Amino acid sequence: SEESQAFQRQLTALIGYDVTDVSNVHDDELEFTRRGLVTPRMAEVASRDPKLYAMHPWVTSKPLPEYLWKKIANNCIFIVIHRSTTSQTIKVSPDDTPGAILQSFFTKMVLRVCGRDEYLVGETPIKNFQWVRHCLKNGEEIHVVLDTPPDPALDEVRCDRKFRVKIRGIDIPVLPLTVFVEANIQHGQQVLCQRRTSPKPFTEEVLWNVWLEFSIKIKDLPKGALLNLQIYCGVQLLYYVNLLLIDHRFLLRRGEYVLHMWQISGSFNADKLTSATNPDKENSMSISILLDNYAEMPNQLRKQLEAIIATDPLNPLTAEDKELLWHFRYESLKHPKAYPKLFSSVKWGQQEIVAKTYQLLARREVWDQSALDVGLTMQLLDCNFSDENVRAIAVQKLESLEDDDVLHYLLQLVQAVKFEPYHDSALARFLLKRGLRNKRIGHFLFWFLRSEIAQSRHYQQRFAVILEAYLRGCGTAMLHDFTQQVQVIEMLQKVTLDIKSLSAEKYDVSSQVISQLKQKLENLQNSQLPESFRVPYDPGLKAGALAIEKCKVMASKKKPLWLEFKCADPTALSNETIGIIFKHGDDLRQDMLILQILRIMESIWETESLDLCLLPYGCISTGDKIGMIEIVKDATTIAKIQQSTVGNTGAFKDEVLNHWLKEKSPTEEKFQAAVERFVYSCAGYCVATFVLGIGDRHNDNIMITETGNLFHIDFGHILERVPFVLTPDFLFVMGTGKKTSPHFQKFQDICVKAYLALRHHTNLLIILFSMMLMTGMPQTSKEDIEYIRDALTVGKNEEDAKKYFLDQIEVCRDKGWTVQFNWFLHLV
Ligand SMILES: C[C@@H](Nc1ncnc2ccc(-c3cnc(Cl)c(NS(C)(=O)=O)c3)cc12)c1ccccc1
């Protein structure tokens, strides 16, 4: 109790929410969930190799791509091993395990990367480490240092009756029309049954005091069924709130309830699904209710069926389709691609059908046998699927994911916890397991959970319980890491928002500001700022002290901070400072998602030996409209390269890039590479942005490295037309008006390969894009979500798609500077 409450403070300061608080819950669910998550926490904590956990070797079973193979001579990889300053080069083969390399080092005469908490340990071949593959791709040498493994002790752990509901009335404290209440019984996002009250004049207190008798029987209520209470005006929806009709102990909800309701701001938004109630009881609308009750197959049908099974995830099912899928459900089980369609053809408001559906879930040889399809697995974890067991088979497949892929899918998986009916779920538990098993995963699980907790009232309660359960088993080592980080974030937060209000949005940075900033940065160091702190978007990097002279406020309207830090690691093999941008202004949950998709797109292209050279820079959301961003070194915008010669006077030149590239590459050998890198990076960002529908961008939101690597930024803003940015300046680097060239040919090659590669995972991209808009972008209608199928040319064959994209290139060359110039004209 003495140091159980001191701990519960520690946990609360990390989470950013008090889980033990019971001021905004009307049942035992959050607490029961906390209780429930001890077993799975301890099961994974107990079954945890102390040494492999402590060194968290980042490894992958995927094959070395063909583009990355073809920079190896004769099984030669030169690992430069260090000790104090006695550097020594060793040739090893791709199959050589790190242990063998140590055995043949002491002979011929544990590893850790230089400047990083990243170890090359365990029974894995050297080629199957991600740090190695990173160095190979960027064309760099693999310097390590031999030191003793860190102590694993540091990671120590501490009725046939119809359903009926009385609508007593609603209570809005202050109005500054007529209203009616609508009560829906929902499962997934299909309304089973629906009843409505009569309208009454809108007062601070309306009382109906009426029984809404539904048709559906009480026995036919499925688990995961919501009572969705909605208030309408007079017709517009004003407030909403949800209540699990079947509670977490399989008990029908009964008794008196006074629910504080969520407001509407004028869609598929996952906040609309939440079982949480509005915590702001003072200002929010309230509602008061009472629950008193307590063979063969014809060939033409097979082809109608297979036509349905083949269709995309956003292609709706007619009732004709659904009767067919249902009737031939045992035939539909043999195809895993049918499963979302099939379980969406179930009448969930009938006990008999659900029973049969559960018999259908008893009989799953093929699903279990089948290879992991994440696109298909993911479909079963969205808003459409409320059934505990339908969802749980999906999580089953996720079990077989390796840590590499879990990282790929972690953000979208954390978002999908919102679609879960109950706080305690297989997915919730899955995440807790994989975060406790792996520190890299657990580091990112922390911030992703903290992200939502910090700016989601609808889901902070559920997430906070999950985060608390992670924190209680992640090990004293990391509790300290997370503490140092949080401290540093919250400290640098104060500075950013305080500095932002010290100057007007119209006025730029002045003598007033730069002095004030540098003053505060000096105050913070000598106070209670930790020596080092692990960089959230790259937990390998320990960051040290502020290089205060290099820190500044950026001439923006958002006044973000350009911060630079010394590497706290002494064995770091350079003095290049760690650059981080702190920014209040935009919501970086949107950017995070977009970047996560970019990485998924890189891994899709890796399956077909393609490198399209994207820079998904690090970007974490830390709190409410605050986050930080990785600074890409030696990088500028396309706008500034235009300004460098011309000025701030439109009139865009074509040859101003090539000069900049020839200016910033010492050798012609490197210029060739800096054009090669540009042609890929450009093409990758052309394809990627087109499909996502964020291709039409200002060119100060497009950046480039001095090594030619192009990359888009600031997806917050975007979230007289052109598919994507392919300006005449880019085309001159390719070597073009309106004619072809050696490099522009390979641009169109690379592009088409990239476009067609993505279309091979049409269903994955569609389900991720849908989920992204539902969990991530409050700014969504069906037509927003059903944009992607058009961009991915669903239905069209291989050839029409190849031609569809080439046409989109020709809109860019026909528009030239017209659209980009209109973007500059948006300075009035
Ligand atoms: C732009 C800034 N420089 C940079 N240099 C390197 N890497 C960066 C990486 C990411 C970003 C970045 C990514 N997403 C967002 Cl939402 C933002 N938002 S903002 C613009 O800070 O308000 C920034 C900027 C970077 C610069 C200054 C002056 C001149 C030329 C560019």
Residue numbers in the entry: 144 to 252, 271 to 319, 357 to 374, 379 to 436, 458 to 489, 496 to 523, 545 to 969, 981 to 997, ...
From the paper:
Here we evaluated the pharmacological profile of MTX-531 that was computationally designed to selectively target two key resistance drivers, epidermal growth factor receptor and phosphatidylinositol 3-OH kinase (PI3K). MTX-531 exhibits low-nanomolar potency against both targets with a high degree of specificity predicted by cocrystal structural analyses. Here, we show that MTX-531 acts as a weak agonist of peroxisome proliferator-activated receptor-γ, an attribute that likely mitigates hyperglycemia induced by PI3K inhibition. The reversed binding mode of the quinazoline core between EGFR and PI3Kγ was an important element in the design of MTX-531, which shows low-nanomolar potency against both of its intended targets.
